[PDB]
Protein backbone atom coordinates (compact mmCIF):
# COMPACT_ATOMS: atom_id res chain seq x y z
CA UNK A 1 0.00 0.00 0.00
CA UNK A 2 1.26 3.41 -1.04
CA UNK A 3 0.24 6.83 0.18
CA UNK A 4 1.35 10.29 -0.89
CA UNK A 5 2.61 13.13 1.27
CA UNK A 6 2.62 16.65 -0.15
CA UNK A 7 5.30 19.02 1.13
CA UNK A 8 5.60 22.82 1.34
CA UNK A 9 7.40 22.86 -2.02
CA UNK A 10 4.55 21.01 -3.72
CA UNK A 11 6.72 17.90 -3.97
CA UNK A 12 4.93 14.59 -3.56
CA UNK A 13 6.54 11.96 -1.36
CA UNK A 14 5.57 8.35 -2.02
CA UNK A 15 5.59 6.08 1.02
CA UNK A 16 5.29 2.30 1.19
CA UNK A 17 3.08 1.69 4.24
CA UNK A 18 0.51 -0.57 5.93
CA UNK A 19 -2.95 0.36 7.29
CA UNK A 20 -1.71 -0.46 10.78
CA UNK A 21 1.31 1.87 10.50
CA UNK A 22 1.29 4.66 13.08
CA UNK A 23 1.67 8.38 12.44
CA UNK A 24 5.03 8.32 14.25
CA UNK A 25 6.06 5.58 11.84
CA UNK A 26 5.01 7.69 8.87
CA UNK A 27 7.02 10.65 10.13
CA UNK A 28 10.05 8.40 10.63
CA UNK A 29 9.65 7.32 6.99
CA UNK A 30 9.58 10.98 6.00
CA UNK A 31 12.74 11.63 8.01
CA UNK A 32 14.43 8.80 6.09
CA UNK A 33 13.41 10.20 2.69
CA UNK A 34 13.85 13.91 3.41
CA UNK A 35 15.99 14.31 6.53
CA UNK A 36 13.35 16.20 8.52
CA UNK A 37 13.19 15.57 12.29
CA UNK A 38 9.74 14.14 13.18
CA UNK A 39 9.21 16.71 15.93
CA UNK A 40 9.14 19.37 13.21
CA UNK A 41 6.57 17.47 11.13
CA UNK A 42 2.85 18.10 11.25
CA UNK A 43 0.82 15.72 9.13
CA UNK A 44 -2.64 16.74 7.92
CA UNK A 45 -5.34 14.58 6.33
CA UNK A 46 -8.76 15.90 5.35
CA UNK A 47 -7.80 19.15 7.09
CA UNK A 48 -7.34 17.41 10.43
CA UNK A 49 -4.02 17.17 12.30
CA UNK A 50 -2.82 13.60 12.91
CA UNK A 51 -1.74 12.22 16.31
CA UNK A 52 1.51 10.25 16.65
CA UNK A 53 0.05 7.19 18.37
CA UNK A 54 -2.74 6.54 15.89
CA UNK A 55 -2.93 4.35 12.80
CA UNK A 56 -3.53 5.41 9.21
CA UNK A 57 -6.70 3.34 9.27
CA UNK A 58 -7.94 5.28 12.31
CA UNK A 59 -8.07 8.23 9.92
CA UNK A 60 -9.55 6.29 6.99
CA UNK A 61 -6.40 6.85 4.98
CA UNK A 62 -6.57 4.49 2.04
CA UNK A 63 -4.45 3.22 -0.85
CA UNK A 64 -3.10 6.22 -2.74
CA UNK A 65 -4.66 8.74 -0.37
CA UNK A 66 -2.75 12.04 -0.10
CA UNK A 67 -1.62 13.77 3.12
CA UNK A 68 -0.23 17.27 3.62
CA UNK A 69 3.00 17.94 5.53
CA UNK A 70 3.48 21.21 7.41
CA UNK A 71 6.79 22.04 9.09
CA UNK A 72 7.04 23.87 12.42
CA UNK A 73 9.99 24.73 14.64
CA UNK A 74 9.91 23.70 18.29
CA UNK A 75 11.12 25.98 21.08
CA UNK A 76 10.03 24.03 24.14
CA UNK B 1 -1.64 45.26 -0.17
CA UNK B 2 -4.36 42.82 1.06
CA UNK B 3 -3.68 39.72 3.17
CA UNK B 4 -2.96 36.19 1.94
CA UNK B 5 -2.48 32.74 3.45
CA UNK B 6 0.90 31.06 3.16
CA UNK B 7 1.23 29.16 -0.11
CA UNK B 8 2.50 26.06 1.66
CA UNK B 9 -0.09 23.23 1.67
CA UNK B 10 -2.24 23.23 4.83
CA UNK B 11 -0.28 26.08 6.37
CA UNK B 12 -2.61 28.74 7.78
CA UNK B 13 0.08 31.35 8.45
CA UNK B 14 0.03 34.59 6.50
CA UNK B 15 2.49 34.77 3.64
CA UNK B 16 4.59 37.77 2.72
CA UNK B 17 6.14 39.06 -0.50
CA UNK B 18 9.76 38.99 0.70
CA UNK B 19 9.27 35.26 1.18
CA UNK B 20 7.51 34.78 -2.18
CA UNK B 21 4.12 34.12 -0.61
CA UNK B 22 5.27 31.79 2.15
CA UNK B 23 5.32 32.74 5.79
CA UNK B 24 8.70 33.34 7.37
CA UNK B 25 8.62 29.96 9.11
CA UNK B 26 7.96 27.93 5.99
CA UNK B 27 10.46 30.03 4.09
CA UNK B 28 13.14 29.11 6.63
CA UNK B 29 12.34 25.40 6.28
CA UNK B 30 12.24 25.81 2.52
CA UNK B 31 15.75 27.31 2.50
CA UNK B 32 16.80 24.14 4.33
CA UNK B 33 14.99 21.24 2.68
CA UNK B 34 13.75 22.67 -0.62
K1 LIG C 1 -1.80 27.50 2.70
ZN1 LIG D 1 3.69 28.75 5.95
From Swiss-Prot, chain A:
Modification comment: Phosphorylated at Ser-65 by PINK1 during mitophagy. Phosphorylated ubiquitin specifically binds and activates parkin (PRKN), triggering mitophagy. Phosphorylation does not affect E1-mediated E2 charging of ubiquitin but affects discharging of E2 enzymes to form polyubiquitin chains. It also affects deubiquitination by deubiquitinase enzymes such as USP30. Mono-ADP-ribosylated at the C-terminus by PARP9, a component of the PPAR9-DTX3L complex. ADP-ribosylation requires processing by E1 and E2 enzymes and prevents ubiquitin conjugation to substrates such as histones.
Mutagenesis or variant effect for residue 72 to K: No effect on ADP-ribosylation
Effect noted on mutating residue 54 to D: Decreases affinity for UBE2R2 in CRL2(FEM1C)-UBE2R2 complex
Mutation effect (residue 65 to E): Phosphomimetic mutant that binds and activates PRKN
Modified residues (ADP-ribosylglycine): 76
Site for Essential for function, residues: 68
Coiled-coil region: none
Effect of residue 42 to E: Impairs ubiquitination by CRL2(KLHDC3) E3 ligase complex. Impairs ubiquitination by CRL2(KLHDC3) E3 ligase complex
Consequence when changing residue 9 to D: Impairs ubiquitination by CRL2(KLHDC3) E3 ligase complex
Topology versus the membrane: Peripheral membrane protein
Residues that bear (Microbial infection) ADP-ribosylthreonine: 66
Protein name as catalogued: Ubiquitin
Boundaries of the shown chain within the full protein: 1 to 76 of 685
UniProtKB/Swiss-Prot annotation, chain B:
ZnF endpoints (A20-type): 1-34
Effect of mutating residue 26 to A: Impairs polyubiquitin binding, abolishes inhibition of IKK activation
Binding site for Zn(2+) 7: 6, 11, 23, 26
Superkingdom of the organism of origin: Eukaryota
Name the record gives this protein: A20p37
Species in which this protein is naturally found: Homo sapiens (Human)
Residues of the full protein shown: 757 to 790 of 790
